[PDB]
Amino acid sequence: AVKYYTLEEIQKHNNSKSTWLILHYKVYDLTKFLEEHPGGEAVLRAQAGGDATANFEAVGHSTDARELSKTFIIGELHPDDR
Ligand code: HEM
Numbered sequence: 001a002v003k004y005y006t007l008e009e010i011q012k013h014n015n016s017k018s019t020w021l022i023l024h025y026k027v028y029d030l031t032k033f034l035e036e037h038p039g040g041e042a043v044l045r046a047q048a049g050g051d052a053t054a055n056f057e058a059v060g061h062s063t064d065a066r067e068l069s070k071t072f073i074i075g076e077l078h079p080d081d082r
Contacts, residue, residue, distance in 0.1 A: 006078040007050060014049025021052040025077040028069055 005020070005027050013020035019031040021044075034041035039059065047055050061069070 003075045004078040005075055007081050010077075011049045014045075019044055019048040020074070021048050022050060022077055023053050023056045023069065025053075025082060026069075026073060027075050027077060028072045029074045030072050033072065 007022075010020045010022060010027055012018075013029070013031075017031065018029065019034060020027055020029050022028075030037060030044060034044055037044055043055075
């Protein structure tokens with residue numbers, strides 16, 4: 001099924017193990033991609049656990065990168081949040 005995640009639940013995934021984040025109300029686990037991500041782990045980590053939409057777009061990310069993101073899609077932002 002799809003499953004949605006609350007800001008809370010996503011928040012708990014900001015550290016040492018699980019880097020989740022929200023881009024455009026869509027939740028992405030990239031925790032295993034930290035080193036792999038050619039923008040550094042640190043910035044992903046720092047932005048983990050919440051809205052990183054503005055950060056993501058402010059940096060800017062190609063079509064490839066946008067499509068890549070979907071491969072790391074776990075679900076969406078809970079309809080209670082938005
Ligand atoms: C949706 C998940 C993400 C994927 C799949 C992804 C993928 C990529 C890829 C492939 C690039 C290379 C640039 C391109 O070809 O577009 C990149 C660069 C970069 N990303 Fe991400 N990214 C993600 C999320 C984020 C987030 C949340 C941040 C914000 C903190 C971030 C910050 C950066 C930075 C700073 C660069 C390097 C920009 C530069 O120095 O030129 N990324 N990313």
